[PDB]
Amino acid sequence: YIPGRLDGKVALVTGSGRGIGAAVAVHLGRLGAKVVVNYANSTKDAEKVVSEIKALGSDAIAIKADIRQVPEIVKLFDQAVAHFGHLDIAVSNSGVVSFGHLKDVTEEEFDRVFSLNTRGQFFVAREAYRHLTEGGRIVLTSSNTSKDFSVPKHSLFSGSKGAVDSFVRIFSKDCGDKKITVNAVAPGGTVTDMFHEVSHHYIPNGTSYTAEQRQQMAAHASPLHRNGWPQDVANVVGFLVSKEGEWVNGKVLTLDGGAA
Amino acid sequence: YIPGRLDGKVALVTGSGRGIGAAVAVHLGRLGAKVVVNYANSTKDAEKVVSEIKALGSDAIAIKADIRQVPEIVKLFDQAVAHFGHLDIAVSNSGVVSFGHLKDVTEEEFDRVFSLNTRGQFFVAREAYRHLTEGGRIVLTSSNTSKDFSVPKHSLFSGSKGAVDSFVRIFSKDCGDKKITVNAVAPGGTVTDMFHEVSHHYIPNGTSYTAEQRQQMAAHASPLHRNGWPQDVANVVGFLVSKEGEWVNGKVLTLDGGAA
Ligand SMILES: [Cl-]
Ligand SMILES: [Cl-]
């Protein structure tokens, strides 16, 4: 046994087709876990993640699922256990962002967001509980916008993550009967491909700045004067799913480099 | 003008067919508001509330809606404004309770809860924003279980209210452009008809006590050594929707008599 490591463990990571999820999947592999790379869209992209994990010396497989469809969540977890023999760790990075003043939010938009961010993650947790070995780990994704950061025209997404915060605290009570801990990570300002698409929403008069000015301003929000990156989130997930993270249970950790 | 009073104001209250909502509707009437008594089921019951409000000296009307159906929310608010001329105050008491270990929660149950408690209340807020006069008030219902009280096998309901907490903080930003404040009340231990139905869920080995033993134990949870009652919640809503409550905005007030 090596401390911090996940040798002999099997992990499943959702949302591995975006920046954070992909960094998480690779990092659990680097730590010694075999990894089920779950993803929603590009199979080519997901196989690149599998390939990285294999190059590091750990085994991996890509299994697709639409997390909006609960029957596909069931099949994903069944297939995970059938392929690797058991499952110890489940990490959800499944989510979509949304912006708009309350007055303009449609039924369709509310459902698009909640079906994945809140309902999807709830049922990922349910299937993880059902499938996990005793002493396992569940981590969901919240956001600094849930409690710690107030963005106008961001009510729908903020609420979708406030639900997750409450879920994890109570999930820890129920999942204790299998000695599984349940936590969430709540990232702030993480730079990925898609950050520059939406960075204007987060500051007054955002569209009057360049993408680079907006990235630099977000950097200054942390007193460390750098942006958050997918690896910053992966580093914390890695500790939570380790043996040494056990006594953190039922909690949401805001990961914004000290901004709040 | 009399301080604390709502003379000349018009209020709409949802869930007026249950204990808390009914006490709220009557109390806003007592404070001088004309009241739209919105309810989900028994028309006879709702007309009893109308009659009380009329006996106190204020006007009232019962308008039914299924708050799960967004088109019915639109019609409710249209009919409210058509009947009284304008609308100043909207209070949602719409919600259903649910219990069960995560492992057993169905798709159908998740949808039953979230459709009313979270989605329904979100769209009540949207329609209130659209219809309210400048300087108005919106109050939604959360729960002590959202953040302040952890009950095993209560994840679904707890999460449905965690969403509302986040909603109101951001709603206050958007609704500020009409000078409307937005808050939530988060009641604990409130005794009504239906409390005795579920009081066993809230204590270890709950079914081995009588209903009266369970009510007495809940009474002792507050350091004031009494139960919470619908009037306790009404008293606070009444202050929030008054002129004097204006500087409380974007907040969730836990109303549990000091239990947490
Ligand atoms: Cl993905
Ligand atoms: Cl009702």
Side-chain angles (χ1 to χ4, degrees):
Chain A
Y1 177 73
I2 304 155
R5 289 195 59 84
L6 307 171
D7 297 296
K9 305 300 169 164
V10 181
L12 179 160
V13 182
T14 76
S16 311
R18 298 175 167 175
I20 296 178
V24 171
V26 176
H27 189 63
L28 304 189
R30 184 180 287 110
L31 289 167
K34 298 178 191 286
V35 182
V36 173
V37 174
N38 169 249
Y39 67 102
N41 190 6
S42 172
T43 293
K44 191 174 179 180
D45 291 353
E47 296 289 6
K48 287 190 211 299
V49 173
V50 168
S51 285
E52 277 199 62
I53 291 164
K54 291 182 183 174
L56 291 180
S58 269
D59 202 7
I61 186 152
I63 302 173
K64 195 177 189 179
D66 182 357
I67 300 299
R68 290 190 172 91
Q69 299 186 46
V70 175
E72 302 197 18
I73 305 169
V74 174
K75 288 195 195 179
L76 164 62
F77 278 82
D78 289 343
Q79 293 177 8
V81 175
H83 183 74
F84 285 125
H86 70 281
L87 188 59
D88 305 294
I89 293 161
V91 180
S92 167
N93 311 271
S94 295
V96 283
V97 79
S98 181
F99 301 88
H101 186 298
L102 166 62
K103 74 191 173 60
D104 296 315
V105 179
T106 65
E107 281 197 64
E108 290 83 352
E109 185 65 6
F110 182 106
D111 294 343
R112 187 179 74 84
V113 171
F114 264 71
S115 56
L116 182 64
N117 290 17
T118 307
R119 194 174 187 280
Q121 293 203 90
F122 180 100
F123 286 101
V124 165
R126 185 193 81 179
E127 290 311 298
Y129 173 86
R130 286 177 175 190
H131 290 80
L132 257 47
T133 57
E134 296 250 340
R137 299 282 187 272
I138 299 164
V139 180
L140 306 183
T141 297
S142 177
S143 177
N144 71 333
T145 61
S146 157
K147 299 178 165 37
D148 286 334
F149 183 41
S150 295
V151 180
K153 308 186 173 68
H154 201 39
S155 69
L156 183 65
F157 177 88
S158 301
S160 81
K161 299 317 177 95
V164 176
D165 290 358
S166 291
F167 289 158
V168 302
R169 190 178 81 259
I170 312 308
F171 287 173
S172 71
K173 308 305 177 281
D174 295 353
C175 297
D177 69 31
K178 290 181 81 177
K179 307 314 162 86
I180 289 162
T181 64
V182 186
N183 294 289
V185 290
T190 312
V191 174
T192 67
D193 278 338
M194 103 100 175
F195 173 79
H196 314 88
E197 223 152 79
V198 301
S199 60
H200 68 284
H201 289 292
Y202 295 114
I203 61 178
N205 253 51
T207 307
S208 68
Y209 303 99
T210 173
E212 313 86 62
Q213 271 167 11
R214 297 192 309 265
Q215 196 186 319
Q216 301 175 331
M217 288 166 71
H220 283 142
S222 163
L224 297 176
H225 285 5
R226 72 171 177 79
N227 299 112
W229 294 96
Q231 193 59 42
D232 294 310
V233 181
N235 280 343
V236 173
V237 173
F239 167 68
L240 293 171
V241 306
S242 77
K243 182 164 145 195
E244 292 78 25
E246 190 188 34
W247 214 234
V248 185
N249 185 17
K251 310 298 184 279
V252 187
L253 301 194
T254 297
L255 311 178
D256 65 355
Chain B
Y1 177 73
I2 304 155
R5 289 195 59 84
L6 307 171
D7 297 296
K9 305 300 169 164
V10 181
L12 179 160
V13 182
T14 76
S16 311
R18 298 175 167 175
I20 296 178
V24 171
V26 176
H27 189 63
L28 304 189
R30 184 180 287 110
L31 289 167
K34 298 178 191 286
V35 182
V36 173
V37 174
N38 169 249
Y39 67 102
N41 190 6
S42 172
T43 293
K44 191 174 179 180
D45 291 353
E47 296 289 6
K48 287 190 211 299
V49 173
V50 168
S51 285
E52 277 199 62
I53 291 164
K54 291 182 183 174
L56 291 180
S58 269
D59 202 7
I61 186 152
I63 302 173
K64 195 177 189 179
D66 182 357
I67 300 299
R68 290 190 172 91
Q69 299 186 46
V70 175
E72 302 197 18
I73 305 169
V74 174
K75 288 195 195 179
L76 164 62
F77 278 82
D78 289 343
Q79 293 177 8
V81 175
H83 183 74
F84 285 125
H86 70 281
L87 188 59
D88 305 294
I89 293 161
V91 180
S92 167
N93 311 271
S94 295
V96 283
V97 79
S98 181
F99 301 88
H101 186 298
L102 166 62
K103 74 191 173 60
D104 296 315
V105 179
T106 65
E107 281 197 64
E108 290 83 352
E109 185 65 6
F110 182 106
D111 294 343
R112 187 179 74 84
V113 171
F114 264 71
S115 56
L116 182 64
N117 290 17
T118 307
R119 194 174 187 280
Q121 293 203 90
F122 180 100
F123 286 101
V124 165
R126 185 193 81 179
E127 290 311 298
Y129 173 86
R130 286 177 175 190
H131 290 80
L132 257 47
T133 57
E134 296 250 340
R137 299 282 187 272
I138 299 164
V139 180
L140 306 183
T141 297
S142 177
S143 177
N144 71 333
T145 61
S146 157
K147 299 178 165 37
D148 286 334
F149 183 41
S150 295
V151 180
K153 308 186 173 68
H154 201 39
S155 69
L156 183 65
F157 177 88
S158 301
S160 81
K161 299 317 177 95
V164 176
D165 290 358
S166 291
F167 289 158
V168 302
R169 190 178 81 259
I170 312 308
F171 287 173
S172 71
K173 308 305 177 281
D174 295 353
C175 297
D177 69 31
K178 290 181 81 177
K179 307 314 162 86
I180 289 162
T181 64
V182 186
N183 294 289
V185 290
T190 312
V191 174
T192 67
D193 278 338
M194 103 100 175
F195 173 79
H196 314 88
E197 223 152 79
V198 301
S199 60
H200 68 284
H201 289 292
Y202 295 114
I203 61 178
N205 253 51
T207 307
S208 68
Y209 303 99
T210 173
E212 313 86 62
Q213 271 167 11
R214 297 192 309 265
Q215 196 186 319
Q216 301 175 331
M217 288 166 71
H220 283 142
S222 163
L224 297 176
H225 285 5
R226 72 171 177 79
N227 299 112
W229 294 96
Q231 193 59 42
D232 294 310
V233 181
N235 280 343
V236 173
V237 173
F239 167 68
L240 293 171
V241 306
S242 77
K243 182 164 145 195
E244 292 78 25
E246 190 188 34
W247 214 234
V248 185
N249 185 17
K251 310 298 184 279
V252 187
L253 301 194
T254 297
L255 311 178
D256 65 355

